[PDB]
Design a protein around this nucleic acid. Structure first.
Lengths: 214, 220, 558, 430
DNA sequence: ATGGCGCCCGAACAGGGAC
DNA sequence: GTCCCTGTTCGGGCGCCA
């Protein structure tokens, strides 16, 4: 029942880079710490034990380090496969605890989000459903804000949004928000506006449309 | 080498209980150092330790769940078990089993796992998707690159598949994970075609939801 | 009355037989007395008339000069004892108040006639047999034998003990809430109950006791606040021993020296640190167990303090489980230590001292160690648990001390306290030889019969020296030779010896010693800035060794 | 309800009044245990009460083993042992199998209970008596006497042999690959199997001991945090074979060369081919002990030579089962402890060292005791006898802590002594 | 009357070192 | 073959207890 804390949540590095992950405990675990590597595809593999000993079949680059209640895990030269989530574990007090792993993502030259806003179709409206969606594709890094602001800048209640992982092709991410308003509200309002704020150029990327047809 | 696969009920009505199984092949729950461990991974969360079964019959749970948790292991057929009673929302997650082994005087980690099972907790039942097309509309195709989209709203059994143009499209497509809207799933997806294309030749998003056996195609 | 307890068997040591000693004739009045007594005991059931075939007999001598209801007409079973098998006294020592815990109500019962209540092995009885000399009137005299446990017989003690226990055992097993300390024929009892409930138990007890034969005289201590038990004064919250009456004037004779010394030692129970050695040294050397010792002058100064202390009214509290035991040591005389064991700061439990030179060559750290352990065993008894130590010494000292010491030594959980003459090591041999100092090649030797020998040395710079001495021996010389080099050393020196004997005695890190020679060496090593030491084999002639050899002896010394 | 087997005659060596040792203080912790455990033994009948009439006595103390059973009762019978007769029943009934030491692992079973199923000589119980004490001496001493075979008495194994043999007979027959040794209260089981396979095999034999002669053995206790149980197993295939006593350098000072020659001179007792006069000549003058650096080239050719001489195992190994074994232990360094086992002086049969203990447990007495116990373990697996220990401590100290660390069932003989730079020279071989 | 215990000096004794 | 030291057990007085 030891509070395990992995300070650094998700870091960014590149091929060839060197990375060190910090895992902190709540009391001298006498090196009773392990390192689990969970690949984006789901599978979790064992890397090392004793916060030092290398697990049979894991490449040298993976070195063990740590003492007292502060330990570390380091990869010599990062290769395309090592980009996953590293979970830190302890085993002194039986309540085995994992301290939220550390994400190791691909560092890419950031780029603005390609924003597109789609207006609710009559194919749906005719059932009272007025679903609006504003796709925010390809942008780096995850750090992105959205604002669903109808006349009055109110973030209308009905904000459902999700974003994808890092597409191992362009190293960016994409997100999409779907504002959920009833046909009633759809007609009532006038123009709907999507506001995407990103490290672009301090410019609020805004795309909107006006057409209260049902 | 040794390996262990798990199996569960897939879906369990809240307040009701369930039983997950870990069928392993390679070791035995009858060897001084061996063991079998159940780790749960909640939606978006990290790794949580549930309990651990040990050869000597010494079973240990997490102080927070033991109340509605019980483990077992039919040693004769290399199968350990995990029983969970009165399941609530939170519990909906992917559970894994892992062969733990006291390697030696100073070493004891989980050596081998196996992609866990997904147990879902929802009062909902089999529901087909409501697939609406996302035509650019109001703002006509401007740039020589247009994004097209498909809204797959209101399906229940999380596994649903979507592709563009019967598989012709793959270059630049994004499909985003669903979100529990009204106990159901609202999943979207969108593509980007180089101007000329869509305006001329037809693009289509085809959705398939095994559970409701409803295959559907939406053009435009 | 006669106890209905099963009789413990007893035999005579494989080799001897019954005691046959001539019964000397008593005083006409004494005989009459002996009659009154024998007859009384007989009419009761303590002894029994015997037959004319028992050829065993112990002597008796009477003297009923005591107060009313008290007399004397016992047997001197000395010879009997000298034949009766041995036992196993069944005793790990007397109790201590400090061990006793606090209860709500307490009592102190006593059984009368204890020894005259438990019966003796009827099979062995025939041995106690005695004769009561007759008044010239009747030719033959009366014959009697003990049917009970006679006093002055090695057996009696252990027997009545086991017996006493067995009787109580049941009672105890049927109500494990009343604490009973059984000592000889004294029964101390306590139990957390209202005096009323207590009385009940105390009575239910008396009834069981008496039923088994053990009476319960009204001498039973009723007064709650004070109980006279094992000599100690038990109060509702403290204990003492007021009978600490000394003999100031009489303290002149040797035998009297021993008196006070003893008295003091005892007083130590609650009376803080006392260096009895003051008077002890007076007793030492003395042999004529009669005459007086003038040394009393030093006591006039030393004992003076002890007296004051013995005057200062002190007392100890009771023991309690919820808290912990803690013992701290003090340093007074050159080998006179004192520890106080308490639980709460001022609330002292029990106090005592330590004063022994394990060997001819010990040192401060050794002594402390000795005491700490000493205290350990004692506590393991009075409470059955190792107390925490407040030893007057800094961590670093203890550290260096034990590390270097190539010998297994340890101390339990102790913390650092500072107050009295801080215990620490004086000198310290140097690890590696210091370059830039003289390197004296020391040596010594003598002849077993000569009764005299020599001690001397040479230096790497050619310097030499040699001195003769008498009343020493081969080993003695080598140790001495060390001194020569020392005295004639600089601020730093790399002394070399061949007598490993001398080497060891030093490595130990001596602080003091009854040996004046070593004492000197020590005192010097102290002042000397840097002192190194190595060992070399004598018959090989390594380095300057071959030189000093010829030097101390040209084939022989003279 | 002891077996109907007949009472084997037991008598002691002539002119020996048997044990009459006094009891040492015990912690409340030990008392309680030593009590509850012995009282039940009263009811079971394997013990009865006796009073002062028995002038004999031996000591008992409780030791807390880390196993599922309970406390262990230990009755120090070393005396009664030497006092007891010579029992041929062991002279033949307990032959030491060489291959025992040669195995990948060996386990230790406490099979003391087995001795309760048999009665003891009616005319001998007076020599087993012990006395349980009390805190502060609340009451006098409670003295118990043995009726059945006492655990840890040289006679016990001797007698029970026939029974122990028939019992193990099946197991050994089943898997003859296993070599089993009996020592006082322990059963030594070795095998060159896999650790897991061995454990299971052990458990089997442990099961068998149940069905037959209700032989109940202590049940170990396993756990997670620091896995001690993984080492409970005794692997002597890689048993520390001493051979780490050397010296080497470049520019040596007088002090250095002088000390070196001092060493060798003594070592000449363990190794014949030794030339000491060589270096002695190199330094045949009253030179400065310190700065002096008599760099010689001649000495080198011989200094490395003495090494070639004492290169490997010494020709002298000769164990004579007629002689005792001696063990010497010295405080060579911090944490580190060194030891040697010999029958004759300077002709050691084996050497070794108890190193650094992997655990924050820091205690001189403890390190030593643990060492002696592990040294004995070795002496048993090999020769089969327990060596007399010349302890590097004072009678007083040892006697107030050896108990609070001991854990074995058997107890060795030991005396107190001191060592010179000769042995503490880091050149252990005594 | 014997029996326990600690204390604080002598005497006696046996055993590594060694001529 | 005998001394050296030297580290312990008794005797032995004592005080204290029943």
């Amino acid at each position: 029942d030891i509070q395990m804390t992995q300070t650094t949540s998700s870091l960014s590095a590149s091929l060839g880079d060197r990375v060190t992950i910090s895992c902190s405990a709540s009391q001298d675990i006498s090196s009773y710490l392990n390192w689990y590597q969970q690949k984006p595809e789901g599978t979790v593999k064992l890397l090392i034990y004793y916060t030092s000993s290398l697990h049979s079949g894991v490449p040298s680059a993976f070195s063990g380090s740590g003492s007292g209640t502060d330990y570390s895990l380091t990869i010599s030269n990062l290769e395309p496969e090592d980009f996953a989530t590293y979970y830190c574990q302890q085993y002194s007090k039986f309540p085995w605890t994992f301290g939220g792993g550390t994400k190791l993502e691909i560092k890419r030259a950031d780029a603005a989000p390609t924003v597109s806003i789609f207006p609710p179709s009559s194919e749906q409206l005719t059932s009272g459903g007025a679903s609006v969606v504003c796709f925010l594709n390809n942008f780096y890094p995850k750090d992105i804000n959205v604002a669903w602001a109808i006349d009055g800048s109110a973030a209308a209640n009905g904000v459902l949004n999700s974003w994808t992982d890092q597409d191992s092709k362009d190293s960016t991410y994409s997100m999409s928000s779907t504002l959920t308003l009833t046909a009633d509200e759809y007609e009532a309002a006038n123009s709907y506006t999507c506001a995407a704020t990103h490290k672009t150029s301090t410019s609020p990327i805004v795309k909107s449309f006006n057409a209260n047809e049902c | 080498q040794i390996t262990l696969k798990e199996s569960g009920p897939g879906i369990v009505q809240p307040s009701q209980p369930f039983r997950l199984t870990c069928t392993f092949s390679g070791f035995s729950l009858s060897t001084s150092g061996i063991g079998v461990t159940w780790i749960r991974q909640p939606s978006g969360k990290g790794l949580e330790w549930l309990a651990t079964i040990w050869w000597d019959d010494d079973n240990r749970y997490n102080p927070s769940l033991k109340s509605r948790l019980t483990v077992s292991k039919d040693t004769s057929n290399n199968q350990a078990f995990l029983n969970m009673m009165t399941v609530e929302t939170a519990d909906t997650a992917i559970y894994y089993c892992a062969q733990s082994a006291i390697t030696s005087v100073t070493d004891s980690a989980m050596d081998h796992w196996g992609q866990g099972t997904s147990v879902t907790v929802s009062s909902a039942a089999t529901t087909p998707p409501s697939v609406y097309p996302l035509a650019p509309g109001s703002a006509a195709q401007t740039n020589s690159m247009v994004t097209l989209g498909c809204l797959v709203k209101g399906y229940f059994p999380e596994p649903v598949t979507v592709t563009w143009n019967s598989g012709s499209l793959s270059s630049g497509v994004h499909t985003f994970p669903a979100v529990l809207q009204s106990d159901l799933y609202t999943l979207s997806s969108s593509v980007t075609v180089p101007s000329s294309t869509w305006p001329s030749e037809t693009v289509t998003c085809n959705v398939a939801h095994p559970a409701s056996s409803t295959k559907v195609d939406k053009k435009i | 009355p006669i106890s209905p307890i099963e009789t413990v068997p007893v035999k005579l040591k494989p080799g001897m037989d019954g005691p046959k000693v001539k019964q000397w004739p008593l005083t006409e009045e004494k005989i009459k007395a002996l009659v009154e007594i024998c007859t009384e005991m007989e009419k009761e059931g303590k002894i029994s008339k015997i037959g004319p075939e028992n050829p065993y007999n112990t002597p008796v001598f009477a003297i009923k000069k005591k107060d009313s209801t008290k007399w004397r007409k016992l047997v001197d079973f000395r010879e009997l004892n000298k034949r009766t098998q041995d036992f196993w006294e069944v005793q790990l020592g007397i109790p201590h108040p400090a061990g006793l815990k606090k209860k709500k109500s307490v009592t102190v019962l006593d059984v009368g006639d204890a020894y005259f209540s438990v019966p003796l092995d009827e099979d062995f009885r025939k041995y106690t047999a005695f004769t009561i000399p007759s008044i010239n009137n009747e030719t033959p005299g009366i014959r009697y034998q003990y049917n009970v446990l006679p006093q002055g017989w090695k057996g009696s003690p252990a027997i009545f003990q086991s017996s006493m226990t067995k009787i109580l055992e049941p009672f105890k097993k049927q109500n494990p809430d009343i604490v009973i300390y059984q000592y000889m024929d004294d029964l101390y009892v306590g139990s957390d109950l209202e005096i009323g409930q207590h009385r009940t138990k105390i009575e239910e007890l008396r009834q069981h006791l008496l039923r088994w034969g053990l009476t319960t005289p009204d001498k039973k201590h009723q007064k709650e606040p004070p109980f006279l038990w094992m000599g100690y004064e038990l109060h509702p919250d403290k204990w003492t021993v007021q009978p600490i009456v000394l003999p100031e004037k009489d303290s002149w004779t040797v035998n009297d020296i021993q008196k006070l010394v003893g008295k003091l030692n005892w007083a130590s129970q609650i009376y803080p640190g006392i260096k009895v050695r003051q008077l002890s040294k007076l007793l030492r050397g003395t042999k004529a167990l009669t005459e007086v010792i003038p040394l009393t002058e030093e006591a006039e100064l030393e004992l003076a303090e002890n007296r004051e202390i013995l005057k200062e009214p002190v007392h100890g509290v009771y023991y309690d489980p919820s808290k912990d035991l803690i013992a701290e040591i003090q340093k007074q005389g050159q080998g006179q230590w004192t520890y106080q064991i308490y639980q709460e700061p001022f609330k002292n439990l029990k106090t005592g001292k330590y004063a022994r030179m394990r060997g001819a060559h010990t040192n401060d750290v050794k002594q402390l160690t000795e005491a700490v352990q000493k205290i350990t065993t004692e506590s393991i008894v009075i409470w059955g648990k190792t107390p925490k130590f407040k030893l007057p010494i800094q961590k670093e000292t203890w550290e260096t001390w034990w590390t270097e010491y190539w010998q297994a030594t340890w101390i339990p959980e102790w913390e650092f306290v500072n107050t009295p003459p801080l215990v620490k090591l004086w000198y310290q041999l140097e690890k590696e030889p210091i370059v830039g100092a003289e390197t004296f090649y020391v040596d010594g030797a003598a002849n077993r019969e000569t009764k005299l020998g020599k001690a001397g040395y040479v230096t790497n710079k050619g310097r030499q020296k040699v001195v003769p001495l008498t009343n020493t021996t081969n080993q003695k010389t080598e140790l001495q030779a060390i001194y020569l080099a020392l005295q004639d050393s600089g601020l730093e020196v790399n002394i070399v010896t061949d007598s490993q004997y001398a080497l060891g005695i030093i490595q130990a890190q001596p602080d003091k010693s009854e040996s004046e020679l070593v004492n000197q060496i020590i005192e010097q090593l102290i002042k000397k800035e840097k002192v190194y030491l190595a060992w070399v084999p004598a018959h090989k002639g390594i380095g300057g060794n071959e030189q000093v050899d010829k030097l101390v002896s040209a084939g022989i010394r003279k | 309800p002891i077996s109907p087997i007949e009472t084997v005659p037991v008598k002691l060596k002539p002119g020996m009044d048997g044990p009459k040792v006094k009891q040492w203080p015990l912690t409340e912790e030990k008392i309680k245990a030593l009590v509850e455990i012995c009282t039940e033994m009263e009811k079971e009948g394997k013990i009865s009460k006796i009073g002062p009439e028995n002038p004999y006595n031996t000591p008992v103390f409780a030791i807390k083993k880390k196993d599922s059973t309970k406390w262990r009762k230990l009755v120090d019978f070393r005396e009664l042992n030497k006092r007891t007769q010579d029992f041929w029943e062991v002279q033949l009934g307990i032959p030491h199998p060489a291959g025992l030491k040669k195995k990948k692992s060996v386990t230790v079973l406490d099979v003391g209970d087995a001795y309760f199923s048999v009665p003891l000589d009616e005319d001998f119980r007076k020599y087993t008596a012990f006395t349980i004490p009390s805190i502060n001496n609340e009451t006098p001493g409670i003295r118990y006497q043995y009726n059945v075979l006492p655990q840890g008495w040289k006679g016990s194994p001797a007698i029970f042999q026939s029974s122990m043999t028939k019992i193990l007979e099946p197991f050994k027959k089943q898997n003859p690959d296993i070599v089993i040794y009996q020592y006082m209260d322990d059963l030594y089981v070795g095998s060159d199997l896999e650790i897991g396979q061995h454990r299971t095999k052990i458990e089997e034999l442990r099961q068998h001991l149940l069905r037959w002669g209700l032989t109940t053995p202590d049940k170990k206790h396993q756990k997670e945090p620091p896995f001690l149980w993984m080492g409970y197993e005794l692997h002597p295939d890689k048993w520390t074979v001493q051979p780490i006593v050397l010296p080497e350098k470049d520019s040596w000072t007088v002090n250095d060369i002088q000390k070196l020659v001092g060493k060798l001179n003594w070592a000449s007792q363990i190794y014949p081919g030794i030339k000491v006069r060589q270096l002695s000549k190199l330094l045949r003058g009253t030179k400065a002990l310190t700065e002096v650096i008599p760099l010689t080239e001649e000495a080198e050719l011989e200094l490395a030579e003495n090494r070639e001489i004492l290169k490997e195992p010494v020709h002298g190994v000769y164990y004579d089962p007629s002689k005792d074994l001696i063990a010497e232990i010295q405080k060579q360094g911090q944490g580190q402890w060194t030891y040697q086992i010999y029958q004759e002086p300077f002709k050691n049969l084996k050497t070794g060292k108890y190193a650094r203990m992997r655990g924050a447990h820091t205690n001189d007495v403890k390190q030593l005791t643990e060492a002696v116990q592990k040294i004995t373990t070795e002496s048993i697996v090999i020769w089969g006898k327990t060596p007399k220990f010349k302890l590097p401590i004072q009678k007083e100290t040892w006697e107030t802590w050896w108990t609070e660390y001991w854990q074995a069932t058997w107890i060795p003989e030991w005396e107190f002594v001191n060592t010179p730079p000769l042995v503490k020279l880091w050149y252990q071989l005594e």
